Design a protein around this ligand. Structure first.
Ligand SMILES: NC(=O)c1ccc[n+]([C@@H]2O[C@H](COP(=O)([O-])OP(=O)(O)OC[C@H]3O[C@@H](n4cnc5c(N)ncnc54)[C@H](OP(=O)(O)O)[C@@H]3O)[C@@H](O)[C@H]2O)c1
Ligand SMILES: O=C(O)C1=C[C@@H](O)[C@@H](O)[C@H](O)C1
Ligand SMILES: O=C(O)C1=C[C@@H](O)[C@@H](O)[C@H](O)C1
Lengths: 263, 261
């Protein structure tokens, strides 16, 4: 039967096991998706076990960047972003992909959030990289900001983006929180309410809590908003299709995640 | 939502659509597998389409060899054999594999055919190369013959095997017809009756007719025989697993192919 897993440290609170349990069941497929606690020092030994016992696996912190080297093939996008979140095993060979980028795009689209820019991504980290990448290829003008200017400006040239000051947020039509600000902090938001734009949309990758201060403020300002669950659901559905050729219902996966969160 | 197909020319009488319709059904999956006529020249474009609406495809004559120069990745085995018969599509990328080689070995095992050599592969073409590759991997002493001596000599040095005269067949214990001799021609066989050994086994990749002159000669000599259907079924099943992660019943697929005949 189909054997899947999410590798990373920690993974005790990953919502993937629950989402893919729904995927397997709803598709009438026999298999399992487990969470394998895997530190970076155990990545090599774990990948070798993947080559022989798993059809595929997702990768989470802190294995997304240190995985490319141990795989037999890495997709272009995954090479540029410099991160792999989805691994496929066929004939003992491992192939690396990044479903976060496309997952993000499909979530916005399916969520009614127009890909009308300029889009501003807060955070020049791994999360920001994937998002910055996706918005570009989508056909939007994209700016990037980072708590630390260094990072931002460097990411702007690599991808060919524009590192702007936080104030520029007011001129953006798409705002994306790619920082860990607000994570389990209902009182925190990386962007002062006064810097929010008139019209546009806001997406927060943080889903704990679901309605972050960022989103609450964005909504009050009248912007379209989307939580972090839709992206989580699509990157997972896209990963399942990549492994089997079958796309589980993204809405159903988000719902499964929702239930696992208890909110 | 699983869209598959066999690319090649001709493919009008391919048994793959039947075998795979069974695989899908038997596995409670929804999908399709069609025969898609494709000439050498129409390949470069056909693959672009595959990238857009196909999860995977099988390639047959005369696309197997040319397909390599139009794929994102090719397996080490497919590379060495020099041919791809199975393509997987993910994120618009194309990966090439060869299930003919592993399929042949699985067919022999499932069919009760002992892996005992020397093995003589007749034909140094694409099918012969896949079979030779498989037999070499299995550790048997492999000999190869080809109507055109050069092709066999090149393959022998290339794979570290031995090119032999057709007469050495009397000393082989496993004989495999990987030539097109006998294809829809009951009067033709690649090996003269008198050159068959009196002990061993024979397998014919040609399955039209099912009981080729070659297999009838082998059977008449007392050799254990296997038709081309088990291999056709196993290469198909293995390809289906490459595409979905699921392995359909090879016996069931062979049965489906038999009926399609
Ligand atoms: N059962 C299965 O699943 C399966 C899988 C693969 C292939 N096959 C079958 O096995 C055959 C091999 O296919 P392929 O891709 O290798 O290419 P092909 O074009 O079908 O066959 C090429 C081979 O046949 C030889 N040949 C042709 N005419 C000959 C003749 N009159 N006398 C002696 N040898 C002759 C060639 O030798 P020269 O170098 O002298 O031309 C070469 O070795 C096909 O007929 C195919 O239908 C079956
Ligand atoms: O929490 C999880 O299980 C995941 C989180 C994201 O990083 C995804 O990119 C990953 O594929 C799975
Ligand atoms: O006739 C067919 O449909 C096929 C013939 C062989 O070349 C196989 O290698 C191919 O995958 C399917």
């Amino acid at each position: 039967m189909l054997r899947f897993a999410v590798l990373g440290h920690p993974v005790a609170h990953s919502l993937s096991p629950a989402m893919h349990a729904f995927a397997l069941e709803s598709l009438g497929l026999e298999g399992s998706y487990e969470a394998w606690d895997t530190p970076l020092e155990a990545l090599p030994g774990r990948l070798k076990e993947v080559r022989r016992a798993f059809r595929g696996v997702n990768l989470t912190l802190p294995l997304k960047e240190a995985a490319l080297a141990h795989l037999d093939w890495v997709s272009p996008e995954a090479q540029r972003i410099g991160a792999v979140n989805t691994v496929l095993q066929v004939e003992g060979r491992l192939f690396g992909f990044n479903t976060d980028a496309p997952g993000f795009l499909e979530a916005l689209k399916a969520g009614g959030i127009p890909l009308k820019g300029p889009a501003l991504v807060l955070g020049a980290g791994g999360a920001g990289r994937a998002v910055a990448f996706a918005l570009r290829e989508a056909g939007l003008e994209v700016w990037v900001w980072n708590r630390t200017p260094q990072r931002a400006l460097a990411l702007a040239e690599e991808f060919g983006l524009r590192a702007v000051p936080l104030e520029k947020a007011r001129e953006a039509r798409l705002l994306v929180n790619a920082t860990r600000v607000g994570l389990e902090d209902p009182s925190a938001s990386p962007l002062p309410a006064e810097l929010f734009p008139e019209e546009g949309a806001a997406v927060d990758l943080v889903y704990r809590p679901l309605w972050t201060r960022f989103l609450r403020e964005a909504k009050a300002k009248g912007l379209k908003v989307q939580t972090g669950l839709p992206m989580l659901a699509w990157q997972g559905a896209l990963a399942f299709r990549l492994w089997t050729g079958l796309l589980p219902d993204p809405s159903g996966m988000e719902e499964a995640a929702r239930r696992a969160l208890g909110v």
